[PDB]
Amino acid sequence: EGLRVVNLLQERNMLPSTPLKPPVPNLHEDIQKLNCNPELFRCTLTSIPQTQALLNKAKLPLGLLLHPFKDLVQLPVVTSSTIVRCRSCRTYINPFVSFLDQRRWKCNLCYRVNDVPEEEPHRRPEVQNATIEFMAPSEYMLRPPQPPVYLFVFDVSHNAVETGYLNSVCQSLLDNLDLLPGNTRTKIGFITFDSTIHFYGLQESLSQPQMLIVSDIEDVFIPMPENLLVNLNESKELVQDLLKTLPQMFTKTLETQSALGPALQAAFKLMSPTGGRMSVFQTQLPTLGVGALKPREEPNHRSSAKMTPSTDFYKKLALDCSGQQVAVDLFLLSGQYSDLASLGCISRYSAGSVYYYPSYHHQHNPVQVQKLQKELQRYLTRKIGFEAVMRIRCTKGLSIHTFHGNFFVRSTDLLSLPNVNPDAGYAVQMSVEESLTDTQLVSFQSALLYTSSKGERRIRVHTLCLPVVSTLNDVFLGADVQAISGLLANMAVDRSMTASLSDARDALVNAVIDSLSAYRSSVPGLMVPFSLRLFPLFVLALLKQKSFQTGTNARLDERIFAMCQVKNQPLVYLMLTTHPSLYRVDNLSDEGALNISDRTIPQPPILQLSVEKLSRDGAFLMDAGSVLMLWVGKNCTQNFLSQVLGVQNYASIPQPMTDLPELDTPESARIIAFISWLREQRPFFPILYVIADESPMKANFLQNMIEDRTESALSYYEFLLHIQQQVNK
Amino acid sequence: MVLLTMIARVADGLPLAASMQEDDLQQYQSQAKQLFRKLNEQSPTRCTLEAGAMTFHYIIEQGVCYLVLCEAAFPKKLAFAYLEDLHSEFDEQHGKKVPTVSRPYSFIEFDTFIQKTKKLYIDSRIMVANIEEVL
Amino acid sequence: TYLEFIQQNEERDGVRFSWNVWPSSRLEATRMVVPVAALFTPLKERPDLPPIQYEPVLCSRTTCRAVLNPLCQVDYRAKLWACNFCYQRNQFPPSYAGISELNQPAELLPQFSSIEYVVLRGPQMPLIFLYVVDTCMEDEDLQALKESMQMSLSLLPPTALVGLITFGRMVQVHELGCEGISKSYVFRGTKDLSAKQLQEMLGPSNRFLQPVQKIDMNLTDLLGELQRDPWPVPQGKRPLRSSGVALSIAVGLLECTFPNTGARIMMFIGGPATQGPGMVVGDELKTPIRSWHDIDKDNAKYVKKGTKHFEALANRAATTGHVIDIYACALDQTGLLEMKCCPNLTGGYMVMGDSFNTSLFKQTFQRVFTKDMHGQFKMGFGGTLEIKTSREIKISGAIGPCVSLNSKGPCVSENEIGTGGTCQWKICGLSPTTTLAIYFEVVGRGAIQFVTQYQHSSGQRRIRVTTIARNWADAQTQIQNIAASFDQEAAAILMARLAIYRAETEDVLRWLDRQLIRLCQKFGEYHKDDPSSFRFSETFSLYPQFMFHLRRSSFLQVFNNSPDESSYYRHHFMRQDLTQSLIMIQPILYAYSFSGPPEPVLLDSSSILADRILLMDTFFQILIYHGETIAQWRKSGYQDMPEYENFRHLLQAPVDDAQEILHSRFPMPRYIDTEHGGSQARFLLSKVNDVSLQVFMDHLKKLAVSSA
Ligand SMILES: [Zn+2]
């Protein structure tokens, strides 16, 4: 542990060999054992500053990062006939209240005393679990629970037909039709579009589906009152037939324009009466009708930081979908510029999310083909909640002032979530509106009201409790370096859209400068507290990431999609992306976790992201969260080539290698176990490709060695040198 | 001559099954839940209420209330024939589980039969009071 | 015999003039009570004339260019001929260099005065059939209609192109044969579209119009799977039916794909248009469809705006050269009054029944596709009529299924009648019974040449040429020769065509009577102010009777009929030959009794005997009436007894005679079996009998012998 002080100039090896654990709030033993899991709910400062003045002096951002709908191992479900809430601020009774009269409880957020209803009260499950799910009563619904409604909207233009994406998507829908969340009330629908809009009717009385073409692009309408959204249970056979015919109907298409705007307007009209989830697959710039977007020239390594949408059509449309409980998920499989900076608004403000597959092609791009396959598997089978809202409460004195993530902020800070999905993350920024001189603990409560895929109104509640400190040092001792990096990234993305990429990159650098300068003016080299010894490293990693990098050759839609991930992803996968984990894997052995039964999993140490840590003699696995890259050195041992890769020499390693073979060797068993254990830590199955040789030109592997200098960015050492010059200026 | 169907347990007004399609709903859905609250063991078991351009119809069987709303011009004869079709089906399927449930809409899946039955009445091919009184 | 002359000239030339001897002076031309006019049947069938396969041969005076004909003076020595219209002398074309006296071309023999040429120079275009189907109707009616359309698909030529348009609330244009999916383009029936717009929204054959031999199996299965308009019909409402937009899309589709070629737009409606442009009535069931009484008291807010929409469509189709048929079967009115211009301007059919699920409609619909002795349809497309006259004759206009090409020349008269101001007309669709009325004006031997270019059902381009000539009246006896040439039947129909045309484009009876009284004074015989002295010759004696029945007919007394029934009767009367036209004006009546074979009897109450069977042919209706005695004898059961096989011959004698005419007639007449006291005997009682003919004649004689 330690309250020690570190000189970043003399260490340079501060990154530990074992995974980073989130800090433990400085709380009494019995309080901390009840606290919310940090994977679900965590704060940038585990010790809340008592006043806004103290928060300002530390020059660190105060905020929460939440993963509210995350898949859980075990979830207590109270079905109580009554839900116990505070009569003033409607806070749910939670483990951190104060029982006094044993029939009266004091709210930990508004301090009002309440009456425990005749319904050992501190033994009740609502007071033993920081995370709990309630059944909602009749008053908590505006309407009967909506059924699950899935509408798939496919681009079928000539460019789309060429990518061949339709074949895999229709195959995944076929394989996963019985796994779609829902009961017998589930409805499914299909729309394709090119210059016109194509609905599909499904009837057991008709020999085949029927394609209904709306050609009036300026005045779309629903051509049929029934059978466009059909009951999946009743019409399973008709849906399966359609999915087999769709990839073959447009082989010889000469349509080259795409009317994405009008298609979404018709898709909205079709979903308006029920709500649900709308999956949109688009492969090019929208060029026809409302929502047309102008072409643009991609930047190169030479242009400086000189982002925002080009129209508000998709934001307005997304706002209308939010009002009807419709969420739009965007799958952009484009080979050229598509103005994602404007298309992304359809998902940001409707609580959807965007998935990007640059230069998808069924024959030319095997990596993107397998990536879409695996991401669609998760998309179609994960749990889902409909027509949802979220409220976030904190103790009197603390005020949320900025929200980050995919939703719509209604009045009085109701977060509107047409869909809630278990892979979405959110962030919130707060300030101390009133001095916390009164209390010594503060609490945070998020509550998610949603409709399950079974038709049951449920409320998921998480409650977090933290202590209040009154000195600069205690603020620094509780700092969570990763959560600070996450919130800063969300803030820099907003700064980019609001100002420029230069301003966002400056404010990121100045966050390190001002914080360490504040620390220095309150104690030669660059002295940081132990809890911030990775702060310049992660911030430098932020500045070389695809969201904020400068002198690189990055294309517009790449940068936008990297920002959309910052806004939407949970903290963990933002850390795995910004600062991938680097292990040596040609020499695994038996210091592992041999604990999980018959498996022995090696546990190689984490290396720092420098080419100095590589070796032409070995092999190195890089865990980047969504993908795993296995780099083989040119001078790699013959044991690793034959016993792990299945190849007699470096030259016969196939160019795209989409995975490792499973050979009958112990070295093979070790690396397969280590890789197995890595992807079991997550639901989004990450693809491994071993192709990163030194010659396949796929070694963007090196774009992640964030400690090394490049022609357009500093090294980690240069960075520390620049911080120090600014700190004691 | 359109729609709003709700099936509720008379005692506490617990909703059991409903079905509504728009493409307002908020005012008449409230009035419906008012009715369920007021109705008790002394209430008329077959009734029609007048809400201006709209008209409520309901029957009460085995402590369960079957309510429908439509424009005042919709044939009152058909509104009650539609409720009997639902009651016989619903009582046959869940009539004995009704008095035990405690969640709202514990029978959402009765949605399906409601709408296949509903379409056999909104296609041409007892007491009377003013709802504002009862409320 | 003047009768043999009239009869033989209709058989050979398919024409019948009101006067066969024409006024030779300006003083008689202006003073003609009934105008010189011709009932002309451009495609009349006859005993197998040889179709002549060569270019016709024409007068070379650019203004003239008449066709070589038997009235032309030829010189087989000098290889010359003299145009009988402009006196221009012409050299014989190379392929005629070998013609001789013994052997001469067909067009010069008087036998071939009406003759047909086949012009084979370009590839032939396929026929085009576009079905436009309503889906807002009962299941039994829609099922019957689907089977009728499938049956007609198996009679079309292999090379013809077919399309399908269905409608209700929306309009669907089906793209045939797509395989694995059936697709169509959907449009709101709430707003209209132009051909240009429609062409851009949709993108020899098309994707929407495909050859039968490639598409027929898919079309049969599509037509078999057609279902009711999926939109529900609320209580007390009519279904939303967008007939006007569906028709404007069918027209627009063909207009931007195959303009200026033969095409048939066959529309099947099962009710009135209740939405869009062309609307006929609102969707409230409580509001009845308009009646003539509603029309006259200005309680029909849809007639004029709806009529305007379909007239625009009719002219669009007729300009393009396409044909619109309206097949309308329903228990209520359907909007024929507003849509009549589409099959009237074009040569389109108009069929009207109570349901598509009757023998009446099913048999009528298949007569449409009657073939000749070569397996080829008895229809023609893109007909162009051009009339050339002597310098003394001018054309006032035409009345019939035709549109003007607005071509000017010295033959065009200033006094225009009907579709006038032209010597060229277009007739998008014609059959062997299509009869035009051409009205002439004089400003021996006058001559007129009828030239009809049209596309045969086989694809061949054809020219039919009829050339007739009538004597100029000898100046010594101008009115005596003229009065001997009067065709009273032809003139009655020709004057009747003039009266219906003025009523349907608004008192008309006052014009009919002044002309009748005037015809009495000029050509009758009488002492002044002695009504009993009036007599007509055999040449004029039936004209008053034809005029009595015409002025009481449902062609002119529109009340007691629905507006759609008035337009249906008038539709078929403006197209028919003379024989059928007379039957419409004056139904023919046959008597059946033990006392002698079947005999014609007067259309008077005095022919209704109690022991007699009457069979009345109304053209529209075949009616059998069993008198009171025969009704009882037949209510008794005497027919079954072997004793009374004579009472069976009697009861089945009119039934047998009905079956024969109940086939030949294209609009299959409704068949009625009734008796004394029966409800349907009303039809016999209203056609029978001012109050009567005797009173009508006496009043006419009083005015004939009095002031001019
Ligand atoms: Zn409270």
Residue numbers in the entry:
A (entry chain B): 346 to 464, 476 to 662, 666 to 882, 888 to 1093
B (entry chain C): 1 to 23, 29 to 130, 148 to 157
C (entry chain A): 3 to 205, 225 to 464, 475 to 537, 541 to 723, 746 to 764
Authors' account:
The packaging of cargo transmembrane proteins into COPII-coated vesicles entails a direct interaction between COPII protein and cytoplasmically-oriented ER export signals. About a half dozen export signals have been identified to date, almost all comprising short peptide motifs, all of them binding to the Sec24 subunit of the COPII inner coat. The ΦC motif contacts a site on Sec24a that is also the binding site for the LxxLE- and DxE-class export motifs.
A series of ΦC-signal peptides was synthesized, based on a core sequence of yeast Emp24p, and individual peptides were soaked at high concentrations into two crystal forms of human COPII protein: one comprising Sec23a/Sec24a•Sec22b, the other Sec24c. The finding that multiple classes of export motifs bind to a common site is surprising, but the COPII•ΦC crystal structures highlight that the common molecular feature is carboxylate-group recognition by the clustered arginine residues of the B site—the terminal carboxylate group of the ΦC motif adopts a similar position and bonding arrangement to the carboxylate of the glutamate side chains of LxxLE and DxE motifs.
